[PDB]
Amino acid sequence: FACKTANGTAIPIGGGSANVYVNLAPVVNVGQNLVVDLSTQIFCHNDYPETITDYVTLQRGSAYGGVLSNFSGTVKYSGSSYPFPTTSETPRVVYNSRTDKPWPVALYLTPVSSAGGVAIKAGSLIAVLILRQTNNYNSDDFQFVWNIYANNDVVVPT
Ligand SMILES: CC(=O)N[C@@H]1[C@@H](O)[C@H](O[C@@H]2O[C@H](CO)[C@@H](O[C@@H]3O[C@H](CO[C@H]4O[C@H](CO)[C@@H](O)[C@H](O)[C@@H]4O)[C@@H](O)[C@H](O[C@H]4O[C@H](CO)[C@@H](O)[C@H](O)[C@@H]4O)[C@@H]3O)[C@H](O)[C@H]2NC(C)=O)[C@@H](CO[C@@H]2O[C@@H](C)[C@@H](O)[C@@H](O)[C@@H]2O)O[C@H]1O
Numbered sequence: 001f002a003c004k005t006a007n008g009t010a011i012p013i014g015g016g017s018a019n020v021y022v023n024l025a026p027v028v029n030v031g032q033n034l035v036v037d038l039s040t041q042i043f044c045h046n047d048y049p050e051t052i053t054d055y056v057t058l059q060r061g062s063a064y065g066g067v068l069s070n071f072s073g074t075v076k077y078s079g080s081s082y083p084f085p086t087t088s089e090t091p092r093v094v095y096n097s098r099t100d101k102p103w104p105v106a107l108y109l110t111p112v113s114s115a116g117g118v119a120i121k122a123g124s125l126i127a128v129l130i131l132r133q134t135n136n137y138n139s140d141d142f143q144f145v146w147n148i149y150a151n152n153d154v155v156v157p158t
């Protein structure tokens with residue numbers, strides 16, 4: 001089991017960490033959501049699907065920087081919605097093919113009433129999403145830690 005990004009970085013068998021940059025709507029009002037869909041950027045596969053089933057959760061999602069200070073959020077994982085930052089590890093998604101499948105995570109971030117001006121700075125860390133991978137075969141229990149960075153400034157008009 002391993003993962004890669006559309007930019008080309010990879011996290012190998014056994015887990016590890018990678019940085020992912022995302023494009024953000026440059027203007028967002030109170031009552032509107034920024035949607036950060038990672039399913040177009042993070043892809044994973046099972047290396048031995050004939051004999052092993054891989055189980056994949058969103059173990060935790062954490063906010064940083066301007067998202068932590070200026071937004072409230074939800075995360076959608078595989079069709080179910082949860083608070084973001086998260087309050088518990090999600091149910092598992094089965095990975096059962098060598099063919100890359102997206103990691104089905106999307107953040108929905110909405111400005112708090114005190115947000116105004118540059119609410120997320122270009123280049124800054126906005127979130128960490130931890131993918132936990134286990135299987136039905138051995139003791140393997142690995143973390144794939146995705147550090148999410150804003151490409152661009154996001155402004156909340158005053
Ligand atoms: C009828 C019968 O029972 N046949 C059994 C064979 O099927 C069995 O072969 C196993 O098959 C498994 C697949 O289920 C393989 O596990 C994978 O191994 C990957 C690493 O393999 C290389 O490195 C090994 C040494 O470390 C070396 O032995 C191999 O030759 C390879 O070069 C590993 O990366 C992979 O795990 C990753 O991917 C999965 C799926 O996505 C994730 O869930 C994991 O988290 C991880 O990311 C997986 O573990 C074995 O490679 C393969 N071995 C061989 C030699 O072909 C054999 C093997 O014996 C078994 O393995 C040893 C170590 C020991 O525990 C034995 O008791 C086991 O039975 O046995 C036959 O009987």
Ligand code: NI
Nearest residue numbers: 002045046047
């Ligand atoms: Ni592979």
